[PDB]
Amino acid sequence: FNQNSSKIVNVLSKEEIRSQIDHFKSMLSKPETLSIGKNPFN
Amino acid sequence: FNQNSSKIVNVLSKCLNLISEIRSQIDHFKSMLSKPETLS
Amino acid sequence: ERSKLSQEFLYPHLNFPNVKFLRIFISNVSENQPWNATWTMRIEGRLLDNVQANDPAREKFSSFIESIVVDFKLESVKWQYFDGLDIKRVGSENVECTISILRKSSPEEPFMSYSPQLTAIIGLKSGTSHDAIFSIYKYIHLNELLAFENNRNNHNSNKLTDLLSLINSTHLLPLQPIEIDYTVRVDKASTYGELVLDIEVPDVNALKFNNTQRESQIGAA
Amino acid sequence: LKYTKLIAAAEDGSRSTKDMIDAVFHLRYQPDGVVVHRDDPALVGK
Prior knowledge:
By secondary structure, chain A is mostly helical. Chain A has helices at residues 2-12, 16-29, and one strand spanning 35-38. The chains are: A mainly alpha, C alpha+beta, D alpha+beta.
């Protein structure tokens, strides 16, 4: 999935779309996980 | 993995709709990202 | 014993999780301005607990914080290693600034943050060296780049396995700080409840109870 | 095993996101390590 996303974005390389491509690439740089801890107040 | 795949597909669909061999490539990319074939 | 380092045994600990949760407030309170200049802004911190503020033995917000930097666009404040940090100055127009907050990192913590050149290839922000090496090897095997390997890893990471296994070692980096952009509000007297950000801090007790109770040690026993 | 049905339901396409996470979770979870609330409707109540 990472390979295909990067590939099709490098192909989309060829204003709004520029800022959006920047946003996408920054988002790909940082994926999100789940942080789980105890529950202080029931 | 599910959440990240979903977010990436949404923002890519938006960016592709905003930019609408070049035309055929864009159409094929739309078709590919429509369903999660990007994994396979 | 061979797979002590793979995140498959480290990431979730639903029986005894490894992290606590800390909440940070960024605010400023304009007082008696023209309607001189008061300019105080505060960074507050508190652990989400049923514990009350008045009770002693509460952990200070500065217990687990390394560096706090505030750069204006005046003068820039840096803190090196109090539940709140207050900064009061003179001036009334307005300012916007960058805040960098770095968190204390335990030695018991087993996860290293990856560099953007890595987390692009593997959809993982942080993992041990073992995970990165295993995934890179799985990658070069998956694309048949195999003992010479030539590509995407080249242009991203910018000759052989003995070569790559240290380029990647260099790629692993120490904990990076949190960056925020915050604007002081001069007409907006109280900016207290707007910017609240939550981060997770290590729980050393859980790490200590976990690394001494591992499948390897219990199996050996 | 304990999660043999929650695992199966995850990749079969059913319960795509919220259904699953609520099924697992007592413990507290946030959607990421760092969560910033640039502006919140309930938090401005302080």
